[PDB]
Structure 1
Amino acid sequence: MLMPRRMKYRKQQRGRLKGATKGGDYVAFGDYGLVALEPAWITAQQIEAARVAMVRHFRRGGKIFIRIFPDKPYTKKPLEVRMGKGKGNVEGYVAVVKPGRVMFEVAGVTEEQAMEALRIAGHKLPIKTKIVRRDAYDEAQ
């Protein structure tokens, strides 16, 4: 449960997402990598649910590192009030992640630790994903 802090403005429009990711598809940080893969939003619940699965099964292990950051105003409106007035308020602090967008990396474990952790983690997300190693993403700034 992290985010920015009421920066500049607080309500911002919806979105349609073809495919580009803007980039950010490599190791650089640590080692073994979990790669997100569909055009959608990353849910905070699923942020720290992935963190759950991780330190949950793998406890007293090594270190895990982040590249991402969940921050989106889920413009939600009150119920049964009949549609119209206003936009809504900043719930569902999701983030914007498309296919091929990687995101999570582990370091200081065994191969299988990564493997299993990434399995259950992928079992949690509002979609699904893939996972790989370290060899051909060298040079990426």
Structure 2
Amino acid sequence: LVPKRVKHRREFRGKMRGEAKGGKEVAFGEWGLQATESHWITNRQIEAARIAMTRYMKRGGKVWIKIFPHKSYTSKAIGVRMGKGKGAPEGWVSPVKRGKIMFEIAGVPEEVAREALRLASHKLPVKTKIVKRE
């Protein structure tokens, strides 16, 4: 996952404080994975979690990725001193704040869903918990 276009190549790291503004409830799926901490999440982590969840589900049911890695983070190569401008964009992240429902799943029985979400959570860096649609 990578945005097709960006208004600005380089972006602030930002700060993550408090609960997520929105997306704290399950919208489409029957079950969801809620972040209990705040952390950056990379497109790689999102993709790894998504693949794990789908593989276990056996292409049964539907999977929604609520988060998207809009933000870009840069880096400086080894052996490069401080200064001389910002680094080149290295990767893409989604700042996820606690309470966000990162993934949703439907069309699968409850026990399969719980195991699938468990695998996805182990791939992600944040501590998580399973949430049922209300």
Normalising by the residue count of structure 2, what TM-score does the alignment of the two structures yield? 0.91
In the alignment, which residue of structure 1 is the partner of 2:68?
Answer: 69
Measure the CA separation in 2 of the matches of 1:28 and 1:85.
45
Contact 1:37 1:102 in 2 (8 A): no
Measure the CA separation in 2 of the matches of 1:23 and 1:60.
28
Structure 1 position 124, deviation (Å): 1.3
Gaps of 5+ in 2: none
Structure 1 position 3, deviation (Å): 2.4
Q: Does 1:13 align with 2:7?
A: no
Identity of aligned residues (%): 60
Contact 1:37 1:130 in 2 (8 A): yes
Gaps of 5+ in 1: 136-141
Contact 2:31 2:105 in 1 (8 A): yes
Equivalences for 1:112-127 in 2 at 5 Å? 112-127=111-126
Equivalences for 1:24-63 in 2 at 5 Å? 24-63=23-62
> How large is the Cα RMSD of the aligned pairs?
1.4
Structure 1 position 6, deviation (Å): 3.4
In the alignment, which residue of structure 2 is the partner of 1:110?
Answer: 109
Q: Which has the higher strand share?
A: 2
Name segments (4+ residues, structure 1) moved above 6 Å.
Answer: none
C-alpha offsets along residues 2-61 of structure 1, whole Å, 9 cap, x if unaligned?
222332211112222221311211122121111112111111111111112112222131
Contact 2:66 2:101 in 1 (8 A): no
Report the residue type matching 1:84 in the other structure.
G
Contact 1:73 1:89 in 2 (8 A): no
